[PDB]
Paper text:
Tropomodulins (Tmods) constitute a conserved family of four isoforms that work in conjunction with one of several tropomyosin (TM) isoforms to cap the pointed end of actin filaments in cytoskeletal structures characterized by their uniform distribution of the lengths of actin filaments. Leiomodins (Lmods) are related to Tmods, and constitute a subfamily of three isoforms: [name], expressed preferentially in differentiated smooth muscle cells; and Lmod2 and Lmod3, expressed more abundantly in skeletal and cardiac muscles. Lmods are distinguished from Tmods by the presence of a C-terminal extension, featuring a proline-rich region and a WH2 domain. We show that [name], and not the C-terminal extension, is the main factor distinguishing Lmods and Tmods as filament nucleators and pointed-end-capping proteins, respectively.
Residue numbers in the entry: 314 to 486
Amino acid sequence: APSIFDEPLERVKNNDPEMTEVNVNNSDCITNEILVRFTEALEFNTVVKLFALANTRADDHVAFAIAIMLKANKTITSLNLDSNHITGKGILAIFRALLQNNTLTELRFHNQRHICGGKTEMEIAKLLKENTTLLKLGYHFELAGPRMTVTNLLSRNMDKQRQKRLQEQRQAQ
Ligand SMILES: [Cl-]
Ligand code: NA
Ligand code: NA
Ligand code: NA
């Protein structure tokens, strides 16, 4: 029973050099199994820069798969998880994976079905301390402490990566 996602999934699996994004945002036809299949196909894909699956009913199982994938994938720079069913458990799995990923620069997960809660926000801020490459975090923190801490950490990271880009440019100047 071939779905409409067969071709894009197989392009990812083939490392199609023209398949530079996977954007399945708003796909009413997609399933959690297909989302996991895309996620596993991305582990060793070296082309895709964006994985966007906003508003696809993605749940914690999809987020766990994504966390695993982020430990392998060195190519995706932007990940859109907005408007799904992911809980603090899924979000924290991803921030734990970001302890072992230095290439993702944008993560967003606005408007989940349920807020993640203050305890999760605190642990997000703690985990982010250890990652110096995330530059954009699309989430509005309910608690001010995590909110301002994360804002300061993203600024830290932006400053650090600008320093590293100048250094790299100067290196062969
Ligand atoms: Cl975890
Ligand atoms: Na694969
Ligand atoms: Na990685
Ligand atoms: Na200078």
